Design a protein around this motif. Sequence first.
Motif, PDB file in Angstrom:
ATOM      1  N   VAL A  64       3.778  -1.292  -0.534  1.00  0.00           N
ATOM      2  CA  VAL A  64       2.462  -1.204  -1.152  1.00  0.00           C
ATOM      3  C   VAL A  64       1.737  -2.518  -0.895  1.00  0.00           C
ATOM      4  O   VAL A  64       2.348  -3.548  -0.620  1.00  0.00           O
ATOM      5  CB  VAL A  64       2.537  -0.922  -2.669  1.00  0.00           C
ATOM      6  CG1 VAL A  64       3.253   0.407  -2.952  1.00  0.00           C
ATOM      7  CG2 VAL A  64       3.248  -2.066  -3.382  1.00  0.00           C
ATOM      8  N   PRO A 110       1.309   8.881   2.829  1.00  0.00           N
ATOM      9  CA  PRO A 110       0.388   7.907   2.226  1.00  0.00           C
ATOM     10  C   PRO A 110       0.503   7.869   0.709  1.00  0.00           C
ATOM     11  O   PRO A 110       0.717   8.889   0.056  1.00  0.00           O
ATOM     12  CB  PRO A 110      -0.989   8.409   2.660  1.00  0.00           C
ATOM     13  CG  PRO A 110      -0.799   9.936   2.749  1.00  0.00           C
ATOM     14  CD  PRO A 110       0.608  10.104   3.293  1.00  0.00           C
ATOM     15  N   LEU A 111       0.359   6.666   0.148  1.00  0.00           N
ATOM     16  CA  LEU A 111       0.196   6.478  -1.290  1.00  0.00           C
ATOM     17  C   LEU A 111      -1.262   6.082  -1.512  1.00  0.00           C
ATOM     18  O   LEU A 111      -1.665   4.956  -1.187  1.00  0.00           O
ATOM     19  CB  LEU A 111       1.171   5.424  -1.826  1.00  0.00           C
ATOM     20  CG  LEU A 111       2.672   5.783  -1.741  1.00  0.00           C
ATOM     21  CD1 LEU A 111       3.571   4.610  -2.130  1.00  0.00           C
ATOM     22  CD2 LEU A 111       3.025   6.986  -2.585  1.00  0.00           C
ATOM     23  N   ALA A 112      -2.053   7.010  -2.056  1.00  0.00           N
ATOM     24  CA  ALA A 112      -3.493   6.797  -1.951  1.00  0.00           C
ATOM     25  C   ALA A 112      -4.087   6.278  -3.258  1.00  0.00           C
ATOM     26  O   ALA A 112      -3.670   6.696  -4.344  1.00  0.00           O
ATOM     27  CB  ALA A 112      -4.195   8.099  -1.559  1.00  0.00           C
ATOM     28  N   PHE A 154      -0.280   0.993 -11.564  1.00  0.00           N
ATOM     29  CA  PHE A 154      -0.965   1.942 -10.691  1.00  0.00           C
ATOM     30  C   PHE A 154      -0.110   3.202 -10.566  1.00  0.00           C
ATOM     31  O   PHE A 154       1.124   3.129 -10.586  1.00  0.00           O
ATOM     32  CB  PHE A 154      -1.204   1.376  -9.269  1.00  0.00           C
ATOM     33  CG  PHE A 154      -1.870   0.001  -9.238  1.00  0.00           C
ATOM     34  CD1 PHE A 154      -1.115  -1.153  -9.321  1.00  0.00           C
ATOM     35  CD2 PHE A 154      -3.243  -0.110  -9.086  1.00  0.00           C
ATOM     36  CE1 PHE A 154      -1.724  -2.410  -9.277  1.00  0.00           C
ATOM     37  CE2 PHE A 154      -3.856  -1.342  -9.046  1.00  0.00           C
ATOM     38  CZ  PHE A 154      -3.095  -2.497  -9.138  1.00  0.00           C
ATOM     39  N   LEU A 156       5.001   5.748   1.584  1.00  0.00           N
ATOM     40  CA  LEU A 156       6.306   6.196   1.123  1.00  0.00           C
ATOM     41  C   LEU A 156       7.115   6.597   2.348  1.00  0.00           C
ATOM     42  O   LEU A 156       6.672   7.434   3.142  1.00  0.00           O
ATOM     43  CB  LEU A 156       6.163   7.371   0.145  1.00  0.00           C
ATOM     44  CG  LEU A 156       7.454   7.998  -0.378  1.00  0.00           C
ATOM     45  CD1 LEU A 156       8.285   6.976  -1.129  1.00  0.00           C
ATOM     46  CD2 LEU A 156       7.121   9.162  -1.286  1.00  0.00           C
ATOM     47  N   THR A 164      -2.051  -4.610  -2.343  1.00  0.00           N
ATOM     48  CA  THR A 164      -3.264  -4.635  -3.151  1.00  0.00           C
ATOM     49  C   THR A 164      -4.405  -5.215  -2.321  1.00  0.00           C
ATOM     50  O   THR A 164      -4.209  -6.165  -1.561  1.00  0.00           O
ATOM     51  CB  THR A 164      -3.066  -5.444  -4.436  1.00  0.00           C
ATOM     52  OG1 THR A 164      -2.389  -6.671  -4.139  1.00  0.00           O
ATOM     53  CG2 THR A 164      -2.226  -4.654  -5.437  1.00  0.00           C
ATOM     54  N   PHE A 216       0.308   7.001  -8.272  1.00  0.00           N
ATOM     55  CA  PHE A 216      -0.027   7.650  -7.004  1.00  0.00           C
ATOM     56  C   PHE A 216       0.417   9.107  -7.050  1.00  0.00           C
ATOM     57  O   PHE A 216       1.611   9.381  -7.296  1.00  0.00           O
ATOM     58  CB  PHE A 216       0.628   6.949  -5.811  1.00  0.00           C
ATOM     59  CG  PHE A 216       0.280   5.469  -5.690  1.00  0.00           C
ATOM     60  CD1 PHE A 216      -0.946   5.064  -5.173  1.00  0.00           C
ATOM     61  CD2 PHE A 216       1.189   4.501  -6.072  1.00  0.00           C
ATOM     62  CE1 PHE A 216      -1.262   3.702  -5.056  1.00  0.00           C
ATOM     63  CE2 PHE A 216       0.883   3.127  -5.951  1.00  0.00           C
ATOM     64  CZ  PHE A 216      -0.348   2.743  -5.435  1.00  0.00           C
ATOM     65  N   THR A 259      -9.353  -4.791  -8.105  1.00  0.00           N
ATOM     66  CA  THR A 259      -8.224  -4.673  -7.194  1.00  0.00           C
ATOM     67  C   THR A 259      -7.752  -3.227  -7.159  1.00  0.00           C
ATOM     68  O   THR A 259      -7.693  -2.557  -8.194  1.00  0.00           O
ATOM     69  CB  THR A 259      -7.077  -5.593  -7.627  1.00  0.00           C
ATOM     70  OG1 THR A 259      -7.486  -6.964  -7.498  1.00  0.00           O
ATOM     71  CG2 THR A 259      -5.836  -5.358  -6.779  1.00  0.00           C
ATOM     72  N   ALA A 260      -7.451  -2.738  -5.964  1.00  0.00           N
ATOM     73  CA  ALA A 260      -6.905  -1.405  -5.770  1.00  0.00           C
ATOM     74  C   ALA A 260      -5.588  -1.522  -5.020  1.00  0.00           C
ATOM     75  O   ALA A 260      -5.388  -2.456  -4.237  1.00  0.00           O
ATOM     76  CB  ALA A 260      -7.877  -0.510  -4.992  1.00  0.00           C
ATOM     77  N   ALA A 261      -4.675  -0.590  -5.279  1.00  0.00           N
ATOM     78  CA  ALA A 261      -3.391  -0.564  -4.592  1.00  0.00           C
ATOM     79  C   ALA A 261      -3.307   0.674  -3.711  1.00  0.00           C
ATOM     80  O   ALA A 261      -3.827   1.734  -4.067  1.00  0.00           O
ATOM     81  CB  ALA A 261      -2.224  -0.579  -5.578  1.00  0.00           C
ATOM     82  N   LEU A 262      -2.667   0.521  -2.556  1.00  0.00           N
ATOM     83  CA  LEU A 262      -2.364   1.632  -1.668  1.00  0.00           C
ATOM     84  C   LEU A 262      -1.020   1.339  -1.019  1.00  0.00           C
ATOM     85  O   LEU A 262      -0.486   0.236  -1.127  1.00  0.00           O
ATOM     86  CB  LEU A 262      -3.474   1.856  -0.633  1.00  0.00           C
ATOM     87  CG  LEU A 262      -3.970   0.701   0.234  1.00  0.00           C
ATOM     88  CD1 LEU A 262      -3.110   0.541   1.471  1.00  0.00           C
ATOM     89  CD2 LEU A 262      -5.419   0.934   0.629  1.00  0.00           C
TER      90      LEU A 262
END
Lengths: 219, 211
Positions: free
Chosen positions: A187, A135-137, B115, A147, A189, B117, A141-144
């Motif tokens: 990824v 996970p890319l945590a 961003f 990988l 958003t 990570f 706006t947020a990104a996740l």
Amino acid sequence: QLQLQESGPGLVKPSETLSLTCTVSGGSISSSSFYWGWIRQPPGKGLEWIGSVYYSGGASYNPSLKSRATISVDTSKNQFSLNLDSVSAADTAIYYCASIYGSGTFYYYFYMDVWGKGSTVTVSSASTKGPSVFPLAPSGTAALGCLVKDYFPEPVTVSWNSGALTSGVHTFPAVLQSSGLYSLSSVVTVPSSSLGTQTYICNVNHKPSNTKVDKKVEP
Amino acid sequence: IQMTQSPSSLSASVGDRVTITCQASQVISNYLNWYQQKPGKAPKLLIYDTSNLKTGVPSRFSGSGSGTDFTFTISSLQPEDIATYYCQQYENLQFTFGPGTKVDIKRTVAAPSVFIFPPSDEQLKSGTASVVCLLNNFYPREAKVQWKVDNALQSGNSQESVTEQDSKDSTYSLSSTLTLSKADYEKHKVYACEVTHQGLRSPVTKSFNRG
């Protein structure tokens, strides 16, 4: 209507034989106006026609590949196939099947009408290796993201919430690591207010290793 | 001796008239056809027999020419039209495709959103740490990403990937991944990526403190 789907292995070892099969649906392969061809695209290069077959079984080949290539047709299963012998790294490519429409009375004119989606073939001595998925945590706006690390050969496919999330998704092109294996990230958003409430899951598929992985990504 | 296409690549504004040329290897007798290959997709026939549009192809596309000299035109370029365009002949009983023309879009400068990570706990348990920096939806492609670890500049341990141009807003996104052993990762506290880009007033830095 007419739809074409390639099928066959992802790795083939040097000097061995590449075998692909294209299954035709939405129409019969036994049409008098249609030919059935194979076209390949080596990495970063253009398109190279390999050969075509008519439903009667008559084939025509690219002269530079005729010695090694064999294209056949099986009307019973509604499919046609490509066998390419004595492969080398030069044969690593995406392989497309396609339908060729022919018309005319005194002259036979052609264009390629419908293409399959292409199958990625890699010639190599190495064994397949499935990826690890991490996970890319996240931290408006947020990104996740996800990988997808250390796999071979190409390709992997990534989707989010089994396709219910497509807005703002970026699945990067794979990079070749110094280890000789590939990796990428995907990824997306999303509204930062949805975090902790909504559940986001990346689905990774790597067919050569028969890997199917779902990874929950949590804040 | 061989097919040519000109130019090999071009950058055009949205709404521009785009004209690309094809030279067949001989005076043609069979159809001269044009295919569009969008990134990650199979080619798609747009124009057959020099000038005829396939059903459902938008009217902004056209083709013309005769003999060995052919042209493909987009009267008003749209963002969805970024692709590689191939001409195709059938002569001497062989299909031959041209070398391709890549069409990109130039648009106004657009600043990235940045961003960062941390490595996941799952990955650390396996002895490796991947730290990822994301630059989202910017233009142009050029951008400087520098990794700093306890204010020390890094080199040789990061790799970058860039998306294809977006088919709606013509921007790019970029990822930079810094890879360390878990041992090396734990020897330092602050991980930061510093982004320099034409759309930014000054460098933007995103960071996190390990622990």
